[PDB]
Amino acid sequence: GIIGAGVDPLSYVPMVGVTGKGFKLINKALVVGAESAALNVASEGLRTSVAGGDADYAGAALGGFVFGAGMSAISDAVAAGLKRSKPEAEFDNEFIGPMMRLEARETARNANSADLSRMNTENMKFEGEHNGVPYEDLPTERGAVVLHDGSVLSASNPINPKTLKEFSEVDPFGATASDIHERLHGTDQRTYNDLYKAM
Amino acid sequence: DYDGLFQKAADANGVSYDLLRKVAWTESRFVPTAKSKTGPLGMMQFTKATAKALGLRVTDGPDDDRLNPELAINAAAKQLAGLVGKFDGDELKAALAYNQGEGRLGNPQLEAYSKGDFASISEEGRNYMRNLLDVAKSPMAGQLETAELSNSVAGMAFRAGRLDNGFDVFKDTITPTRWNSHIWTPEELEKIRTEVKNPAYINVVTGGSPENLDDLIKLANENFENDSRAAEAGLGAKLSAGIIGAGVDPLSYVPMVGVTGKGFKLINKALVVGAESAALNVASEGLRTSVAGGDADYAGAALGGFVFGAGMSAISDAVAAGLKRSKPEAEFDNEFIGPMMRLEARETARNANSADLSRMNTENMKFEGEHNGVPYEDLPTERGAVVLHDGSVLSASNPINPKTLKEFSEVDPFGATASDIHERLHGTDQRTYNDLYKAMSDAMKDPEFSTGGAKMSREETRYTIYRRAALAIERPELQKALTPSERIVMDIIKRHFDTKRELMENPAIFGNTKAVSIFPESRHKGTYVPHVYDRHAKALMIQRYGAEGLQEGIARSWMNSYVSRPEVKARVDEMLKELHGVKEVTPEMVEKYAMDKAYGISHSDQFTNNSFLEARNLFDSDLSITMPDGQQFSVNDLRDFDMFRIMPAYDRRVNGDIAIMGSTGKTTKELKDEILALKAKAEGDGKKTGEVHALMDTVKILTGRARRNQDTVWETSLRAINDLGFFAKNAYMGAQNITEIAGMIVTGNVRALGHGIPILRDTLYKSKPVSAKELKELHASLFGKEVDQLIRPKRADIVQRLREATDSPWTKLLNGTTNYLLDAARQGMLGDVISATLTGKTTRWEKEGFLRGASVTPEQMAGIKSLIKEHMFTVKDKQAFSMDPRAMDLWRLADKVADEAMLRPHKVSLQDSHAFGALGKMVMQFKSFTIKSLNSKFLRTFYDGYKNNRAIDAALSIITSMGLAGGFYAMAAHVKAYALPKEKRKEYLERALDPTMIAHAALSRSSQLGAPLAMVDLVGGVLGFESSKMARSTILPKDTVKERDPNKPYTLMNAAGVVNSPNKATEQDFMTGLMNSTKELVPNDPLTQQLVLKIYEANGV
Amino acid sequence: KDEILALKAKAEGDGKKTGEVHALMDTVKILTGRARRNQDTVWETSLRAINDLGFFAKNAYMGAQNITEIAGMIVTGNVRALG
């Protein structure tokens, strides 16, 4: 319960010691059907090939969750800081949406089911469509897109294809040669990743 | 159409299987295409849900009009699995949400349901929801609702139970837990290998206990500490003294998880008579063995033999009283008290160094005997048995007692010489096979393969160890990254092949000094691992771009290495200059050479007298070239591995060629010509020319054609133990106890699986006379097992990959029994497909919605290929029958049907018990017995407590192995009987269907997969060469055939050590051979024994 | 070079299917690695990457959404504050 609990944390200890470590957010509640096992031999957990892949992620999350809940609390605080002038304008404001739909996704990742962060469903999947994926705009918080699942992508994200279009929009026998290029660009990316880890 | 698709779509991403069938029936009434009043045109009837649903899951969709036969079923199955997930384990609400829409009008109803079945729900809603009052299992399902008109108790029960009609043996019995069913992440293996002392305890989960592996390590270490502190003392002490005599049952005992061995030596106090502490010689001692673990493998076996034997005794006393309620007495002997007591006394004599009180005595006489040397005598007592000259008595239904061995071989379905070379080689190669088997049994048990949830298992878990041990040998960089407890198998393989190489380059390390380098290409310096290309991998490559495709692929794949290395570029040109051409070698020369030497693998199936060393084409086959369709194509994919049909099928050819070389010279040309030119010269009328045919036989045996003989392991072990009793009086008792436990386990399995399983109880194991029309079914059942062994792809990573390339009844858990049942039901389905199509017709299969991997045209073909080759039906068995590009479609049809219908419903039922086939019902009832046992009180309470899906695997694997063993022998027995004179001479039929022979037939038969190495390769002493002495002696005066005869017959390892080794055996050699070859039928982990026990006793006797 | 050009300077100015030869000259440039300073963005690749990842791997699907969502939230917080 990082949000649902949920704290601020705006007045918290400097939090020096923590790194990771034992942070898996199985929010009690927000878990619905808890199929313990697996859907395939894929799934599993973060399907990664570096050691530390389950701790880099964890670190990011503690740092993402704390920061997101804090942005939510501080936007609630500045809301009241503006209520003293006028009682209400619209004030939405804020990231409660993205942070809650991220906490639910994390719980579904750690608890192996119950994707309760899925908007649903209809329609239709027009207009799209930057690359293959068709999206749909939800009349709600600015942006955003909804997928075919549809796992919703908050606006101001690097993925949501509406924003990607908007940015690419107005702003400042033996064979072959191409097979060689793809083999090489697929192995050299891997060795770049292995070099980045060691660096 | 049809439920085969549902079986495969509902085992993915969900789900209660019967839900999909019910939804399909209700929404479509089984019509492939569709149209509706409200708009939806499909089986699951979705038009609004076309784009979103197809996109949202594993497979995406294209248009409206193209609602696919599979892509739609899987998409709807995923939607329903989400609806089951998105709410709760309450499938009825999921069904209501699908039918009435999620979120439209419907959404109030879905919420309304959450308050009781109600009336907020409507005409189609509540009625359709009620239609699915079968499986399962919502509270509202009991809450929806709400003789015939009688009170009287009966009445109340009748009107309340309300039959459910659904059961998944996988949600109510074995539930896949988190830790089990987790393939291990490639990094987590590194943590398990370093921070776990023994990986066997990663399975046991009493908790708990996530997350995560950083907790499972802390648990599987603390449990291993808690084990070796106390489990050992308690179990050993309690059973060590007085296991029978004490004596317990143990029928009501703790699941017995912790115990392994350890401190179990059964010195029964009492039954020890004269206790001479020391020794009779420098032999005796204790088990005279040459493997470490030899004193613990035995111990394990014994705890597992003693517990199981005492348990069979107690359960036969219990079923005795269970039959006393009908009649007070018939004879009821019944039971194994005899064998188990005479085994306990032998164990006590072994551990206490004297007092063989398990010795019958004595007289007489030692007639009749006598299968091999040993004379026995029949005791009028319990059925059988023999008594020896000691006489240590051998219980009937043992693999040793020579009366039974005869009964089974009876009616049922200066420098010298060449022969000395053969015996030296067969005596050292058996030793290196044993040393390889030890390391393989030690490696196939590392965490990757076993601790975690099952992955490749188990015929593949040895194939993917031999693949690594071969690919590390041939290219040595890949080596460097191999697990240590596994590098010791690569070391032994490399040393064995290197010794054969070092001995073939100069096979003059023997009597003669001629005979030069049998080997194909000396100077090509590497451990040559035999390149033996496969039949089925070549079939898959000749199915697409058939002839010139592969003929160019295996050429350019070698041409890659020819330019990718600076030293093979030299060692190819050094060969090419010598054959044809002056120093400068044109790149056309190497191209023609590679093309013509790949053609040998392209067209003629030479690789699956002359030999197969010859395929040692000088190029290195590691790099893959790209085919015009995209798939990268190497040659190691054409190659083979698994050291099972490779190592012992290469060693015999090499040992034949080496021995014929050490005689005088080359095998083909020289030997053949000379032996024939004595035939065609002297002569048809010659009375002593059959004696020349005698020497031609020496040649065949030595060379290794061997006339498919090596009749049995056990007829060798009989004389082995008879002679072992002379010198080593302690290993004598050890080898009797191990074989006695071996025989007792199988004779228990025959009784239990005969009472419990229906097809076996009233017909197959039934005495006589004949099943009237089941002859037409027994013929097809046996022809199925013939055709499978004739066609199946003789590999391991080509069968499961081909099976899953299309994507107990579930191979994710208890994979051991599922493998046997798959490779069993497939022969039944295949023989049914052949017999039906044959002459006469029954096309259940031709019209199938299980039409995957078989289109209309391939299915129709599988029909004409079957019709052209057999008639009402052991017919062909032809070389062209196997080298048929369309024949692999038959194998694939059969296996896919056997894994779609016969072996992947989560419940046994009445599907085919008034239908095909003879073996189909046998395997269906075996799966039924598996589920029935897996629901017992003992076994269910053991799983819930400890999980450990590997222990019940190793329990239900032996049961099904010995069961199919008995079945395939009983089925052939009736056919042979019906071929015995039809004048009823079924007394003969009786002489061969009885638990004293079935227990033996279920030993020297019935693979028994997957085992590192083989049963035969580990024991065998090929003896004579009697007719060889006949020829030598009788042609002494005669001409020159003599001049040939003194050549062949008499009257770790470096190449120098093979010659020095003795040419017969060592007592430790046969001891380790017997102690190893029995681990595949008498296990080590002593808890799977007592699991098998409670499985048997729950079933009956 | 020679060969691609000698198709250009031989066939030819008026040739309607010679822009298709200019098409292959582009293949050459891309393969060789001049690449026309393109690789527009990391993210337009990761979009389809995650879209297809959602099909097979339903756990890494959620992982890759969470990491990118935190990435976007941090920067959209930085814009507001530093504005």
UniProtKB/Swiss-Prot annotation, chain A:
It is found in: Virion; Host cell inner membrane. It comes from the Viruses. The N-terminus contains the transglycosylase activity (Potential). The C-terminus is essential for the viral DNA translocation into the host cytoplasm. Component of the cylindrical core that assembles on the inner surface of the capsid during capsid formation and plays a role in viral DNA ejection into the host cell. The inner core is composed of stacked rings of gp14, gp15 and gp16 proteins. Following binding to the host cell surface, the internal core is diassembled and gp16 is ejected along with gp14 and gp15 into the infected cell. Gp16 probably inserts in the host inner membrane and remains associated with gp15. Homotetramer. Interacts with gp15; after ejection the gp15-gp16 complex composed of a gp15 octamer and a gp16 tetramer probably binds both the viral DNA and the host inner membrane. Belongs to the transglycosylase Slt family. This is Peptidoglycan transglycosylase gp16. The chain holds residues 331 to 577 of 1318 of the full protein.
